[PDB]
Design a protein around this ligand. Structure first.
Ligand code: MKS
Ligand code: MKS
Ligand code: BR
Ligand code: BR
Ligand code: BR
Ligand code: BR
Ligand code: BR
Ligand code: BR
Ligand code: BR
Ligand code: BR
Ligand code: BR
Ligand code: BR
Lengths: 112, 115, 115, 112
């Protein structure tokens, strides 16, 4: 699994479940091509986005729909979405995001 | 000053100086129009981006150029940039301060919204 | 002002006002001596804790009373308090600004150290 | 496993390995009694700190020795250690910490 995303809720101290996200790859013309999407599981994780053969080097954007997550919990948030934009480099990627209504953090753990 | 950005460097324990950022506003056709741009000062702040009159309701994207920042210091970071996307002014004018704390493989961003 | 603390609330997008904090300095016998205390203002800042003369080298603990803060708002948080422990002034006097961003189950803290 | 700790390094984008920590329980006289300790594994995790029978309600402190971690990497950090102080309440606890030299964040995920 080359690319995994994990989302945590800082208000409830829980996995952020049923959070939608879309992954985009940057195309030669600088537009964002849909690449992969899904919703986090009960453990706040989204696995199976892509495969090692498909996940070639390039710039990707993960757009996490944080606004709908907070709306379904009855809480007005600041951001429209969270965006994590990175280059995938051949020299496993776990993207993590901690959500608060007016703040979020994101970190990448890149391992073997 | 209705929209200010402050950036901090978590490796050095200092303001993040000379960080470039581009602000965009979503147009009627769903594209991102350029709105304002600038770079942080020696206190890590960027003031004067826009005015109360020009900062009307809309969806704004602050794109902070973190990769350029870290590269200029010889560090190869993870992200291309930090993106802060939010609806502004949709219950009347507010003042926004967006903060970002930068590490090479992580960042955090928060907004303080006053009236 | 050699030691300032700024606290932000990540649920409300605001300064964290009336947050109490106690600063301790490690004594020769390895115990924590009370050093200064105060509470944040309406801008979420606490200034005037100490003076250049009194803030000598040592190991300091800033204990931020986050549980009292959240409880006063009807939220049951996870932490008792946020603790920031650091050696100060050990290459000469510096100015420290400690920031903390508070959520009910998480917090972050950063220091900016100037000379 | 009632109590797990996970530590991540924000400079290298990696698990923080071989990080020492000690866990204390608050005693009736307000002192901190040693309770459990260990070092994070290759995956940045420390499991097996305590058992469900021993982990009774009370106030605990996890002291993460972040200073020695940065020192062994040749980097001068700000904090002496990171401290996470919480009440364990019978109404599984995963404590996570993201380390930077001049900053850290910590979150709790409390699940069933
Ligand atoms: C918000 O703090 C947390 C947190 O509560 C849980 C976290 O869980 C993670 C789990 C992971 O497997 C991995 C990958 C580690 C490998 C060795 C592949 C993680 O990086 C995390 C977390 O980063 C994590 C975090 C910290 C992330 C933030 C504060 C954006
Ligand atoms: C939560 O992210 C914020 C934030 O929203 C506001 C912040 O305000 C600061 C103001 C400051 O003057 C200084 C000192 C900079 C000097 C040149 C002395 C700050 O460091 C901050 C912030 O740290 C700050 C932050 C980031 C702090 C976190 C993420 C714990
Ligand atoms: Br949008
Ligand atoms: Br640009
Ligand atoms: Br300047
Ligand atoms: Br890009
Ligand atoms: Br602010
Ligand atoms: Br006290
Ligand atoms: Br005041
Ligand atoms: Br306590
Ligand atoms: Br100490
Ligand atoms: Br977790």
């Amino acid at each position: 699994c080359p690319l995994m995303v994990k989302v945590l809720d800082a208000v409830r101290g829980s996995p952020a479940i049923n959070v939608a996200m879309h992954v985009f790859r940057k195309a030669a013309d600088d537009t964002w091509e849909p690449f992969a999407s899904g919703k986090t599981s009960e453990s706040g994780e989204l696995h199976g986005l892509t495969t090692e053969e498909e996940f070639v080097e390039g710039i990707y954007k993960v757009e996490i729909d944080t606004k709908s997550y907070w709306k379904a919990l009855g809480i007005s948030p600041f951001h429209e979405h969270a965006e994590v934009v990175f280059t995938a480099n051949d020299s496993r990627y776990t993207i993590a995001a901690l959500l608060s209504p007016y703040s979020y953090s994101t970190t990448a753990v890149v391992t073997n």
